[model samples]
Target: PVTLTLYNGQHAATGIAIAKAFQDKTGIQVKIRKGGDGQLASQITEEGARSPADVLYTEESPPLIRLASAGLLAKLEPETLALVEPEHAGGNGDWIGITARTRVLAYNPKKIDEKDLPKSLMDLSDPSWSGRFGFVPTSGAFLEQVAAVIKLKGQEEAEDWLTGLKAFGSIYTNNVTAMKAVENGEVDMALINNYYWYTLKKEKGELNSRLHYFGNQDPGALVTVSGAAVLKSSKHPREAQQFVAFMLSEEGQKAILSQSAEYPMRKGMQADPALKPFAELDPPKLTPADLGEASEALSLERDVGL
Candidate 1:
């Protein structure tokens, strides 16, 4: 009657499916407590060694990095870590990515030609590109992108780009809304996670905007990972480790892909047919540790009056 506690910060259905798959496979039931990634990370941090969370599964790497940096995560086994590519595993071996999401520019071809799109995410800040795109300044995904900028380009460049965005870009409340803005041609383009465009297409049966991938290791093309980590406080460490390892299992990865559009971390796993081929993506060379917690990015957002 072993039950593992999972602080799930992924899509609710995806979390349930993963937990169910793990439970069915191993008979180690998972008690999922769903919340935002930041909320659960903070709760686990505050609870420290006494936290009941056996594992943390979340939408982005920053939350896991926060815990790992705090020394609140257990070292994952080499076998478990090897289930994913080295880039997909946390630099510290304390966590590994379960899924991957890429940042893409969604632009209205009617309003702006494909050739007119900025060469880099940073280029969107220039005066020529001003007022041409939409962004969700407060979205967690956007924050993670900002963190990537800081890690790759340094704070000065990040600040300048953000400031330019504030001065020129239309700000929306969420990814869907921003995508809508682009689709409606209210703005020529929007910065969004690639899956949102697929979701929008599913909902509308048509799209006015098309995705523009910023390949060549561009920050605009940054790939963010959904991470899974075993908590240091786990009482059921064996079960917890099993749960993490199961995420890379074929069955578990299939369950994840069935419920979410994100790319699976396990090598050789095929992504959704609608998505761009995983191998074709040329995202920046930043790991989970490089992305780290969004504290600095959040601070930069506030400092820039975003």
Candidate 2:
């Protein structure tokens, strides 16, 4: 019987799926305006209390942090505040965590043995692996990996690795294409989210590729969470909060779990049986909001000729 605006940057179709389901069940109309997380977030920051978004959903958390820091996001509902971990929330209930994905290596056993694979993202920079691997130079996942590196190792060394990667690996437009190349023996291995390999397996029904996760708080294993928040200027705060709550509901979480390989962020929800357990993942301590000089990271990638 009511409607609201959703500024969504999530990659999963489930975001759109829930919009339909939520509308269907509640008679509420959700008009989705999809764009890059940073771009849409900047718009909200600029708009301040005049921002039109009832809710903002994104694949990464930094943009939400920018909104919260500017006092542009409304305090989340207590129900949502209790649904996710405090670390994933934007503190004092400004936003809520929806789901997460992990960085990992997708390798072709036909080309390189797991025993011979590089141990850390730090080593992927070594000249020993030149021209034998692939990576998506410009995707958010790759940028966060660089940001995590800058957070852990400092700029000059992170620059060296980015430059090293540009020289060592064939650059792809995105991760799945890189993974497909790995499966086809077009390259030995590729840096990608672990679930891409699982998607490949589901598609080809036995693709020979495998995932190797980096451990010990390595930047290579940085985890990113998708976030949900209500805008301070929302015309329908109730509907917006309902949308946020829908995202954390078991029904909403299950849509994401069944529709994609992404790990659900809710405490009691288990990941898919087809995937590796989330406990095995050892992500860095960046806490989803530590986007250190992202422009510099992008510039450094360019300096490396990526």
Candidate 3:
């Protein structure tokens, strides 16, 4: 029943809902190919001009940045491009935001007093706060966070932060573990995405700890977008473009907030009630294009031996 293929980098439930909704509306059958954003980016690059993908939807903006940097993406329509703010999509013009997430400190209420919560990300690097945190060095979300660090602070400061991170922070293999560590009071806090707390609250019926929001242009308050782009190799540019348009439409924005629990990137959409209003996050203006190299983050991450 499907005639189009979308290489979807979103979680399955939402991705499938998205595709099915489009299929019902357009009668243009669509199929989804699911994989990690970086994994599929490598696949798309290897496929070159012959890639079967008409669209590549990613969980974050950086991979879309990588594809745009490599010349694999098609320019977005100015009309459709108007759907999101330029900062959300970056200056790349090759991809548009699908949803968003912000970085936050997930902290235990018992270990850290409410008044002592850090307002700046840099505080975590101080010896007084060093060993009191948790982080996941290898998370894709964390890589984007690193890229933001590099953009806000120079490489030297970013490296120093990582060094301090390794010296003081408890190392977790993934974000879920890092978040749970705070819940168990295994550590006082963890640098994590806001979604982890929302999801935990949804399932566990209560927040084991509190989320310290670092607004005010702090690097930890950086917003990361899940993005979508049309690949230049697609044979169905018309349908691909339409799909991208639909994802940016008010209806698509509705699905993201109601179904996925992620922050909607399209203007005029309210987020799930559990989330803070999007305007208040006050994240820095850094873009995916501003993020230098995922490789750079990995190199620095390894340098910290994490």
- Model 1 earns a TM-score of 0.91
| Model 2 C-alpha lDDT per residue in residues 93-177, reported as the tens digit of each score | 7888898888888888878889898888899889999998899986777877887898899998998888788777789998879
Per-residue CA lDDT of model 3 for 80-132, tens digit only, reads 78988887774758888889888888999899887888768877777888678
Clashing pairs in 1: none
Question: Could you tell me every candidate's TM-score relative to the true structure?
Answer: 0.91, 0.91, 0.91
Model 1 CA lDDT for position 59: 86
Taking all chains together, the TM-score of candidate 3 against the true structure is 0.91
Measured by lDDT, the strongest candidate is 1
Between 2 and 3, whose lDDT is larger?
Answer: 3
**Deviation from native of the Cα of residue 152 in model 1, angstroms:** 3.3
lDDT of 1 by residue, 1-306 (tens): 988899999878889999999888888888999998889999998899889999999888888888888999999989998889987877889999999988999999998899988989999888998778899987778999999888889999999999999999989998879988898879989999888887778889988889999988988888889989999889999889989999998999999888778898987788988899877888888777677787899999999988
What shift in Å separates residue 113 of candidate 2 from its native position after superposition? 1.2
Candidate 3's displacement at residue 108, Å, is 1.9
